[PDB]
């Protein structure tokens, strides 16, 4: 898809992850991203927060050390690109 692109975990910690992405070209930049993270396969709903669209990084804190999670980054609309997701284990 268009945006976002290259979602990765810059730095990590038993309880926290530092993620980043590529916002694209200047004409592709957006006002906000909404970010979703949760235990993969667990019976728990995902938690979510929005980040200003002039940022390419975001930190996720308060995680359980030793559980595999999944993180997704949504654009304002799905008209630009489908959300990209990755799986990371703390």
């Amino acid at each position: 898809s268009s945006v976002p692109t290259k979602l990765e975990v810059v730095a990590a910690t038993p309880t926290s992850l530092l993620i980043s992405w590529d916002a694209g070209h200047w004409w592709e930049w957006v006002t906000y991203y909404r970010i979703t993270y949760g235990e993969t396969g667990g019976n728990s709903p995902v938690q979510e927060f929005t980040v200003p669209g002039y940022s390419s990084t975001a930190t996720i804190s308060g995680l359980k050390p030793g559980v595999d999670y999944t993180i997704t980054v949504y654009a304002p609309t799905s008209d630009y690109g489908s959300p990209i997701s990755i799986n990371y284990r703390t």
Binding site: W29, V30, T31, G53, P76
Partner: protein
């Protein structure tokens, strides 16, 4: 002099109007920001141009330039319709707005 920066106040009024149309629901960064700052600029230049000129004539020209420019740049950039009925009905709409603001 306050007349000319009143003209430019209406020009930046057209600017954030077109910039808002490029943002699609205020979601695309950069057109969204041009919308905010161009609106701030229009408000500030207007506040100084109205400090000397009559409030009724300043606002009538300020919204007249902003409205007509948004109509023209709309049909130009975003290729908006140019019907003989559409041009007549907005001519009636703009004269009414210009008239009411010039009487208060």
């Amino acid at each position: 002099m306050a007349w000319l920066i009143l003209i430019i106040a209406g020009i930046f009024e057209v600017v954030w109007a077109i910039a808002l149309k490029y943002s699609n629901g205020f979601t695309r960064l950069i057109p969204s920001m041009i919308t905010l700052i161009g609106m701030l600029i229009s408000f500030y230049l207007l506040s100084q141009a109205t400090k000397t000129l009559p409030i009724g004539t300043a606002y009538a020209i300020w919204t007249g330039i902003g409205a007509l420019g948004a109509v023209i740049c709309g049909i130009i950039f975003f290729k908006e319709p140019l019907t003989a009925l559409r041009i007549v009905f907005m001519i009636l709409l703009l004269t009414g707005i210009i008239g009411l603001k010039a009487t208060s």
